[PDB]
Structure 1
Amino acid sequence: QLSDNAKTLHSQMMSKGIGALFTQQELQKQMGIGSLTDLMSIVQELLDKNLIKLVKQNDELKFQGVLESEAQKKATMSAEEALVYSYIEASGREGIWSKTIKARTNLHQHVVLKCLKSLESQRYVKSVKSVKFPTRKIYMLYSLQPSVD
């Protein structure tokens, strides 16, 4: 069920979620009761409903429970930031540099600029000038200011 398997599948995430490294085989490690498509259909919908969370790393795919503020946050955001903002908030502590997004996101600079301007007004990002040269304007989540010096 959408709500039932959502709330009890959100329960493993809010309780543990097998940390960050949780994969889909780790779901069967906990709940193997769900049939292949039953657990995956509600997976896909809850990401569409911004309830589960996916991370792209290592093998399979990582998953974590949503804080639900970021959920409606990105749901308010456009399709650009929907990946772009989420792709950048996956950069973690060191953030990411602008122009390398184009090769990663397959977009212009003109199209990625204005949404970065929105996130500036949204104040979920901030331009960071680090030790390396100030041609960069690398971006991380405005929530944090970590760096190497």
Structure 2
Amino acid sequence: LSDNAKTLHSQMMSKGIGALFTQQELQKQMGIGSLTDLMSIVQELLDKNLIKLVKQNDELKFQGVLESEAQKKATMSAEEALVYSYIEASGREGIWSKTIKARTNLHQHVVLKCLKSLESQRYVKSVKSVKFPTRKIYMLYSLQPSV
């Protein structure tokens, strides 16, 4: 059960983060268990919020992340983790506070109170753009201002 999960995320740690993983290679990588039990521990590992659901175009795809930043976001309550997930999904170009309000249904106070708490925890910085100025674009501390 849990020991096979220790073997599962070792395969997620085996490769450098790129060259994203999927099941048809992972079933050939790990086929000691049948798929009736392979899926159950991954859904349990979705409940252990370490595996995520990435999308390569039009079809089914997985990606496993580092644990050291997984406990980082598990410090937050589920609403602060909800805004944090979109703001790293942009990553390379940033997100606008109107777009981060539309995709979540959180209204104007509950999103503006959310990231204000998130900025004190050193998890969002605020840059101004030049392709469209006078617009608040947020990023992580990765410091990727391609604009």
**Distance verdict in 2 for CA 1:25–1:60, change over 3 Å:** farther
TM-score (norm: length of structure 2): 0.84
How far the C-alpha of 1:45 sits from its partner, in A, is 1.6
- 1:103-126 Cα distance to aligned partner (Å, 9 max, x none): 211221211111111121111111
CA contact (8 A) 1:24 1:60 kept: no
**Identical-residue share of aligned pairs (%):** 100
* Whole-Å separation in 2 of the counterparts to 1:97 and 1:34: 44
How far the C-alpha of 1:137 sits from its partner, in A, is 0.9
* Whole-Å separation in 2 of the counterparts to 1:17 and 1:33: 24
**Distance verdict in 2 for CA 1:117–1:38, change over 3 Å:** same
CA contact (8 A) 2:22 2:63 kept: no
Matched pairs, number: 147
CA RMSD of aligned residues (A): 2.2
How far the C-alpha of 1:61 sits from its partner, in A, is 4.4
* Whole-Å separation in 2 of the counterparts to 1:102 and 1:57: 25
TM-score (norm: length of structure 1): 0.83
How far the C-alpha of 1:34 sits from its partner, in A, is 2.9
Q: Relative to structure 2, which stretch is displaced further, 83-92 or 43-52?
A: 43-52
SS at match of 1:55: coil
Specify every segment of 5 or more residues in structure 2 that has no aligned partner in the other structure, as ranges: none
**Distance verdict in 2 for CA 1:37–1:90, change over 3 Å:** farther
How far the C-alpha of 1:62 sits from its partner, in A, is 3.5
- 1:54-87 Cα distance to aligned partner (Å, 9 max, x none): 3244244443333222211111112112222012
CA contact (8 A) 1:130 1:147 kept: no
CA contact (8 A) 2:20 2:63 kept: no
Q: Relative to structure 2, which stretch is displaced further, 119-128 or 34-43?
A: 34-43
CA contact (8 A) 1:22 1:62 kept: yes
**Distance verdict in 2 for CA 1:59–1:5, change over 3 Å:** farther
* Whole-Å separation in 1 of the counterparts to 2:110 and 2:33: 41
- 1:118-145 Cα distance to aligned partner (Å, 9 max, x none): 1211111111111133332111112323
Q: Does structure 1 residue 50 correspond to structure 2 residue 49?
A: yes
**Distance verdict in 2 for CA 1:125–1:4, change over 3 Å:** same
**Distance verdict in 2 for CA 1:37–1:113, change over 3 Å:** farther
Q: Relative to structure 2, which stretch is displaced further, 58-67 or 6-15?
A: 58-67
